PDB file of C-alpha atoms and ligand atoms in Angstrom:
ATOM      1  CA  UNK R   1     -17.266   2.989   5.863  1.00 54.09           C
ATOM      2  CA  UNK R   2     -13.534   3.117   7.243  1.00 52.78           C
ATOM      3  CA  UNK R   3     -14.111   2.441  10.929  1.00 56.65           C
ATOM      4  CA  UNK R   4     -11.495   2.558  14.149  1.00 52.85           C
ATOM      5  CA  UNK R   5      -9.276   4.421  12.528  1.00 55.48           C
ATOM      6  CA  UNK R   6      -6.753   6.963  13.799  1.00 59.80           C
ATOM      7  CA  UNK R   7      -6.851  10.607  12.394  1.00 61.06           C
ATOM      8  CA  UNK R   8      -3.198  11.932  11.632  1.00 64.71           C
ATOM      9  CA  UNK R   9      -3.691  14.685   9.477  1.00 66.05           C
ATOM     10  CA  UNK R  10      -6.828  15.954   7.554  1.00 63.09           C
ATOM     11  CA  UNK R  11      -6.215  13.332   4.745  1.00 63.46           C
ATOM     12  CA  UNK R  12      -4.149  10.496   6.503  1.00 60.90           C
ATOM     13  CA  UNK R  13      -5.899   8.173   8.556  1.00 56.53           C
ATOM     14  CA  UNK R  14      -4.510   5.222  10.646  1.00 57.21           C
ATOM     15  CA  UNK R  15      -5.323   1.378  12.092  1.00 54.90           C
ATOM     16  CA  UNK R  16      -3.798  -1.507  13.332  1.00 53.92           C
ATOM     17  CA  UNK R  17      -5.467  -3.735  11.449  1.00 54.42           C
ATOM     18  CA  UNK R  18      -4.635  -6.536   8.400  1.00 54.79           C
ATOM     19  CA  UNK R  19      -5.087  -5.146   4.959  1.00 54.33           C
ATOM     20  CA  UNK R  20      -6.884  -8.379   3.790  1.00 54.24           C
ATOM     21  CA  UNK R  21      -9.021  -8.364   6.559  1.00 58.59           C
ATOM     22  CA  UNK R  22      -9.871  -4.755   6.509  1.00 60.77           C
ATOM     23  CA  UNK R  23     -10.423  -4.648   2.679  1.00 59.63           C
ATOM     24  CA  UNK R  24     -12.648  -7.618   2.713  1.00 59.78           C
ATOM     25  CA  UNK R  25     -14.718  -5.830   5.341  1.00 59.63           C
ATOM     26  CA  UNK R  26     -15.082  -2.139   3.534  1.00 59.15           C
ATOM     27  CA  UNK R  27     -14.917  -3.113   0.021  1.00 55.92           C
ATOM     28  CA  UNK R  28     -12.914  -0.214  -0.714  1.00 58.13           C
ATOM     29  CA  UNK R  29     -12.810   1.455  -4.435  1.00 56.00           C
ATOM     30  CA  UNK R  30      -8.990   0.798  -4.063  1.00 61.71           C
ATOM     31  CA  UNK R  31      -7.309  -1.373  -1.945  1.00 61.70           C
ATOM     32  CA  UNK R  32      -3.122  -1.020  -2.249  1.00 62.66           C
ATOM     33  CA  UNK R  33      -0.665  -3.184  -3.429  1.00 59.32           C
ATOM     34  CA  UNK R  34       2.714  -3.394  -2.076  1.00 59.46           C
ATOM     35  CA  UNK R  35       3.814  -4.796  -5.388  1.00 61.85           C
ATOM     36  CA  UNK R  36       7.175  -5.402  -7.401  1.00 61.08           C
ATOM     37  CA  UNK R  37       8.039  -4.530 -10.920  1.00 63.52           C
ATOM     38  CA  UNK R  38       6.815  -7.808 -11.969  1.00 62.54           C
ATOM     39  CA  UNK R  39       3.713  -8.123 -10.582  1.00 64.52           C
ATOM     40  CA  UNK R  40       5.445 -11.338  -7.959  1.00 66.69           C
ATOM     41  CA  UNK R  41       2.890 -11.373  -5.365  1.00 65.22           C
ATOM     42  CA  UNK R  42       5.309 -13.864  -3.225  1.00 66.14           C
ATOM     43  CA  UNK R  43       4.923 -11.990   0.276  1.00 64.08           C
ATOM     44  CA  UNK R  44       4.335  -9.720   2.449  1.00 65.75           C
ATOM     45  CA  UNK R  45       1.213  -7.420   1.843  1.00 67.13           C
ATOM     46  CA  UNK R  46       1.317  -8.757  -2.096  1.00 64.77           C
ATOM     47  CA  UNK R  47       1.649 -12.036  -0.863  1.00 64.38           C
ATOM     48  CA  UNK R  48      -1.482 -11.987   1.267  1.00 64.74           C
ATOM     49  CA  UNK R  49      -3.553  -9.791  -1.120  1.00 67.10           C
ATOM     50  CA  UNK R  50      -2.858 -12.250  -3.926  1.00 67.16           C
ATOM     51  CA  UNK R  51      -3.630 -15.394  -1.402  1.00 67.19           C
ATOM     52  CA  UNK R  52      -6.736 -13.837  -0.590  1.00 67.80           C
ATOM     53  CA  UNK R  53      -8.216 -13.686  -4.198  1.00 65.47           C
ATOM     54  CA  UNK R  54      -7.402 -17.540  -4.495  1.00 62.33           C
ATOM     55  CA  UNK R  55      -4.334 -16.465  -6.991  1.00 61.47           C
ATOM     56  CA  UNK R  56      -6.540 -14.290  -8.963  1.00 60.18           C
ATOM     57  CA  UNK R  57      -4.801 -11.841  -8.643  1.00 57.28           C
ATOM     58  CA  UNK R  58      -1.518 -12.950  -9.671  1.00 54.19           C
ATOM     59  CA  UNK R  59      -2.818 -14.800 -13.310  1.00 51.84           C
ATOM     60  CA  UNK R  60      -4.292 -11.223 -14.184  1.00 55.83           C
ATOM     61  CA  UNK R  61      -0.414  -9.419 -13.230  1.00 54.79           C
ATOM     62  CA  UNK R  62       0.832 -12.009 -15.168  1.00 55.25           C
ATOM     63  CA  UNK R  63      -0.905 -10.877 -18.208  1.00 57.89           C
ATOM     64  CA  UNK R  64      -0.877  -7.424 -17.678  1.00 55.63           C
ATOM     65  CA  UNK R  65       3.309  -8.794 -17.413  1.00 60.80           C
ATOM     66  CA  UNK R  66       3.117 -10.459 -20.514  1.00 64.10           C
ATOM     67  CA  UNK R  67       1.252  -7.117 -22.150  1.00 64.54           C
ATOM     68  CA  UNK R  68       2.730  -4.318 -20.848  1.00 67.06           C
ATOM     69  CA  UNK R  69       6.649  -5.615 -19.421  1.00 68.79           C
ATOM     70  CA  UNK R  70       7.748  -4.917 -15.899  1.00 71.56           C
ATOM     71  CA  UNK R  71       6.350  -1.612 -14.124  1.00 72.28           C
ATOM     72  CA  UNK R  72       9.360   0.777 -12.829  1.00 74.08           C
ATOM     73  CA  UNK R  73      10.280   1.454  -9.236  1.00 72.58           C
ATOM     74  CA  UNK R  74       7.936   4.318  -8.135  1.00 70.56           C
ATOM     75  CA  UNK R  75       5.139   3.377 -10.452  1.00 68.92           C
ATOM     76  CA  UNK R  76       1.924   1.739 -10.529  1.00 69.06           C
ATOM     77  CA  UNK R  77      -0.779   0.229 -12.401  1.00 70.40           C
ATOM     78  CA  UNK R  78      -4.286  -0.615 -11.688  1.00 68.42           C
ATOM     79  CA  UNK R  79      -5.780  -3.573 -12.014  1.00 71.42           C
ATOM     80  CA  UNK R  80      -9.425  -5.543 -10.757  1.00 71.38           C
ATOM     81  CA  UNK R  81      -9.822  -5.480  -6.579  1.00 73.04           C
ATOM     82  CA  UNK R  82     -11.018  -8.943  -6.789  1.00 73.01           C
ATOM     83  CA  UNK R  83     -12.655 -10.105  -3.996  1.00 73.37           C
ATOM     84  CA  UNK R  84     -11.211  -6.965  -1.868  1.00 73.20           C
ATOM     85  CA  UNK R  85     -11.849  -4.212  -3.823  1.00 73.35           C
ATOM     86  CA  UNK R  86     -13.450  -2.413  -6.897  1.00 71.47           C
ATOM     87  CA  UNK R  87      -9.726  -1.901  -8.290  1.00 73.36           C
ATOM     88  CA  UNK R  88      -6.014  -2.849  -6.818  1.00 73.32           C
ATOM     89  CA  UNK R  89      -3.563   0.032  -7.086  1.00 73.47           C
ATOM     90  CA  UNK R  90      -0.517  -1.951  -7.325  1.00 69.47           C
ATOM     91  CA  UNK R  91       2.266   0.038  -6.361  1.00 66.85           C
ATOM     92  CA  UNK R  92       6.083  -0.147  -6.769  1.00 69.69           C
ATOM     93  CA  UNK R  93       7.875   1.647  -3.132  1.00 71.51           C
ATOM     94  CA  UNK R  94      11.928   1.194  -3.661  1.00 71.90           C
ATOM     95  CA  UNK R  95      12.980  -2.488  -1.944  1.00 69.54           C
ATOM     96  CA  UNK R  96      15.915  -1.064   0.432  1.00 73.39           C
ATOM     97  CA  UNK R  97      17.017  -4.775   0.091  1.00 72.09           C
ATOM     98  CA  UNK R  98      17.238  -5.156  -3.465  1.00 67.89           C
ATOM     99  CA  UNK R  99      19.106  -2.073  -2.994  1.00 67.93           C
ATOM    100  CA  UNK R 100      16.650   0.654  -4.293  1.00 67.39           C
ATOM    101  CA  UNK R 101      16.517   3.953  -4.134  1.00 67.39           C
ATOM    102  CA  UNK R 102      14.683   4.909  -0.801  1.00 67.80           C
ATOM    103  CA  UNK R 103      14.375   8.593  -2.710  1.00 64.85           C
ATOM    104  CA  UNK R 104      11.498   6.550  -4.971  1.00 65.24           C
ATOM    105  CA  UNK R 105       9.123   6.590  -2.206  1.00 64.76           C
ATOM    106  CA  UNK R 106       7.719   9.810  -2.523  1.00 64.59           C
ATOM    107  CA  UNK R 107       7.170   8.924  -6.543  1.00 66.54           C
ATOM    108  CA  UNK R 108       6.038   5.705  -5.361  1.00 66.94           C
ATOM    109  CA  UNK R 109       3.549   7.268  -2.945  1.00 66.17           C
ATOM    110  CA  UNK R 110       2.374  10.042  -5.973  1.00 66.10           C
ATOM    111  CA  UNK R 111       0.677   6.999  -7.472  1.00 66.95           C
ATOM    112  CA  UNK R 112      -2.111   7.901  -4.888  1.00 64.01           C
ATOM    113  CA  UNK R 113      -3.137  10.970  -5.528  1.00 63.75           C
ATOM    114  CA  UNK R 114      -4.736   9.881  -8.651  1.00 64.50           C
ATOM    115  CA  UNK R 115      -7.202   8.043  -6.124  1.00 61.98           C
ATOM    116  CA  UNK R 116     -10.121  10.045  -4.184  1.00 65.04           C
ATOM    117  CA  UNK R 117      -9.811   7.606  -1.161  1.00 62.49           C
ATOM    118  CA  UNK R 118      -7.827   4.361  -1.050  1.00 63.51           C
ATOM    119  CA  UNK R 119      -7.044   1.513   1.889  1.00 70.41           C
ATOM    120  CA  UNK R 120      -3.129   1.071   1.688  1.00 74.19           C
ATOM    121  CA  UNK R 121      -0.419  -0.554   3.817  1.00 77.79           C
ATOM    122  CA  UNK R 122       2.693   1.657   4.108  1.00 81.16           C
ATOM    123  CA  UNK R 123       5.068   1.886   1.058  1.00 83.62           C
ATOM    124  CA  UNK R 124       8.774   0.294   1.212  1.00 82.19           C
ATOM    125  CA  UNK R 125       8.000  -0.980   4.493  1.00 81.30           C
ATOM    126  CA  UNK R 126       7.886  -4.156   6.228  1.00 81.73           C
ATOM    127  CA  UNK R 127      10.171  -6.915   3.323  1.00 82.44           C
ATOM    128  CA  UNK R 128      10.533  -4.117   1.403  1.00 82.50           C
ATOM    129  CA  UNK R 129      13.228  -2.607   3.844  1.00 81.13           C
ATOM    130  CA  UNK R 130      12.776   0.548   4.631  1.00 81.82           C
ATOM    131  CA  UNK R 131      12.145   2.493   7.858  1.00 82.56           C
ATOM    132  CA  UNK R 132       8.260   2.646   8.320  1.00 84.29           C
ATOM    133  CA  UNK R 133       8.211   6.047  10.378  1.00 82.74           C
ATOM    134  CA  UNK R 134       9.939   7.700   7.444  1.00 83.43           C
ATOM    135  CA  UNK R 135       7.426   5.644   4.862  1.00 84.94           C
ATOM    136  CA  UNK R 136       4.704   7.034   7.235  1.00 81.78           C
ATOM    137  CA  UNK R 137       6.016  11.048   6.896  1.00 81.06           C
ATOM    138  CA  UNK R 138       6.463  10.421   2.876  1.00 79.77           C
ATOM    139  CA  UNK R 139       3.022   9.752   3.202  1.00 86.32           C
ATOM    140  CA  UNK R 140       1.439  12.376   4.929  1.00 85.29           C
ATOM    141  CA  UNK R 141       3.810  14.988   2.824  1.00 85.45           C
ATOM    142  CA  UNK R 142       3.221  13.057  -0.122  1.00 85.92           C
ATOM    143  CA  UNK R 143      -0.980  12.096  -0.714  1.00 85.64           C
ATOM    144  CA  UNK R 144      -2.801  14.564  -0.951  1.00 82.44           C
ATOM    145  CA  UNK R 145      -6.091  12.311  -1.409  1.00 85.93           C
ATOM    146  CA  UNK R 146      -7.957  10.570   1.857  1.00 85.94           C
ATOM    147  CA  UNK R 147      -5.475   7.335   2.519  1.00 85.33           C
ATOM    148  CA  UNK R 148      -7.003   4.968   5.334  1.00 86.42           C
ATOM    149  CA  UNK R 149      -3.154   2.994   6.129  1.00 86.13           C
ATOM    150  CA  UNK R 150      -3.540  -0.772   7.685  1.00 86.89           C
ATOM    151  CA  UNK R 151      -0.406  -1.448   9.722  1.00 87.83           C
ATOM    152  CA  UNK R 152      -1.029  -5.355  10.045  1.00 86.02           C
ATOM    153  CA  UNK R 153       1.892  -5.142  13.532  1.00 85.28           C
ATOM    154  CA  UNK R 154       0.624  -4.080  16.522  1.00 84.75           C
ATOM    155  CA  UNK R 155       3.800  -2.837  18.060  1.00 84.50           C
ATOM    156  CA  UNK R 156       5.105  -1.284  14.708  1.00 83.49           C
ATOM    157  CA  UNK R 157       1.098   0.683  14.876  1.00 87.21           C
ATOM    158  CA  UNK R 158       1.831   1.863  18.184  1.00 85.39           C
ATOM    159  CA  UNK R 159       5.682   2.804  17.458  1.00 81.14           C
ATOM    160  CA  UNK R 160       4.065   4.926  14.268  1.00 82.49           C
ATOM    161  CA  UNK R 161       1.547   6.451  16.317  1.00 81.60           C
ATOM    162  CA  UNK R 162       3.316   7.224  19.215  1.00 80.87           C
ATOM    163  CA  UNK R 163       6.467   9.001  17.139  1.00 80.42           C
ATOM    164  CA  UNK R 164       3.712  10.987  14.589  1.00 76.59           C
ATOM    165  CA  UNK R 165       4.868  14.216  14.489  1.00 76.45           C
TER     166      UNK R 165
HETATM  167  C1  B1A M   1       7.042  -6.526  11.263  1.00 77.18           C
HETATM  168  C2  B1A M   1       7.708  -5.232  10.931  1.00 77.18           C
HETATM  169  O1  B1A M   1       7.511  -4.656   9.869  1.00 77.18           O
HETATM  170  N1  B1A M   1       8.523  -4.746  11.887  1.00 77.18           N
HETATM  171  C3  B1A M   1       9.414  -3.657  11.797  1.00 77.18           C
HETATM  172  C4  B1A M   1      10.513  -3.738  10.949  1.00 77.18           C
HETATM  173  C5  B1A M   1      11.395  -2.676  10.846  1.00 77.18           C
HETATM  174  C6  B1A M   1      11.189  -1.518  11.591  1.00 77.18           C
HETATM  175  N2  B1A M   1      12.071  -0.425  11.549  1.00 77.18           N
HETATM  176  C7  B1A M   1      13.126  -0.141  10.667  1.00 77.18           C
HETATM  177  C8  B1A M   1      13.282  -0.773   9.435  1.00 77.18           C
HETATM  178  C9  B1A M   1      14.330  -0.416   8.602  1.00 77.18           C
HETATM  179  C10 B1A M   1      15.218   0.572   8.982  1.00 77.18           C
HETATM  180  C11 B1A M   1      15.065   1.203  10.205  1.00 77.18           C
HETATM  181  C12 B1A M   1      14.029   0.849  11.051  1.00 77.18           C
HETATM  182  C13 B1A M   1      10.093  -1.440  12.442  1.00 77.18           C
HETATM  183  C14 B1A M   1       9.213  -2.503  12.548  1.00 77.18           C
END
């Protein structure tokens, strides 16, 4: 039910399009998280998901806090989708500005191959820091399963396309 997107490779798949918007509208099984080690949905793509599920989202990751103690950088849990999905795949890409390791991304992106199909925004990108063209090759050399990416600017979607090797 993925619709208007961009084909990049044979499992990598491509719209301009805001995750909150675009999960509310498939449903997906698994809708991505662009989450930090303690479940803080404050911003960006976290910040919107969270907003979107009327906080929700953050009392369950602050359980699953309380439970289980921070997740690491490159790792993931999954928790309830909420209103936007069956399940959220919240997943930790390295935050270039907290000074992370931008080598975590490919670890970070891992975490979906555990998923037939998921909608996802691109890892370590946008607050997180890092470059989104190189986010958007870890990707593609990284998931293996079907990964339908949202890339909520316009000009940043076009940039990505336009560079796609
Ligand atoms: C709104 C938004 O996310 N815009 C945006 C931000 C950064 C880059 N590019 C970049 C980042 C870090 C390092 C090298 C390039 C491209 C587009």
């Amino acid at each position: 039910s993925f619709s208007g997107y961009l084909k990049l490779t044979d499992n990598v798949y491509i719209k301009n399009a805001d995750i909150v918007e675009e999960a509310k509208k498939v449903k997906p099984t698994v809708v991505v998280n662009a989450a930090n080690v303690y479940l803080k949905h404050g911003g960006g793509v976290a910040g919107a998901l969270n907003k979107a599920t009327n906080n929700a989202m953050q009392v369950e990751s602050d359980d699953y806090i309380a439970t289980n103690g921070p997740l690491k950088v490159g790792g993931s849990c999954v928790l309830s989708g909420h209103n936007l999905a069956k399940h959220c795949l919240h997943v930790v890409g390295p935050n270039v500005n907290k000074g992370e390791d931008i080598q975590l991304l490919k670890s970070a992106y891992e975490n979906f191959n555990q998923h037939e199909v998921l909608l996802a925004p691109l890892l370590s990108a946008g607050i997180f820091g890092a470059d989104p063209i190189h986010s958007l090759r870890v990707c593609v050399d990284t998931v293996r399963t079907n990964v339908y990416l949202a890339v909520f600017d316009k000009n940043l979607y076009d940039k990505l396309v336009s560079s796609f090797l």
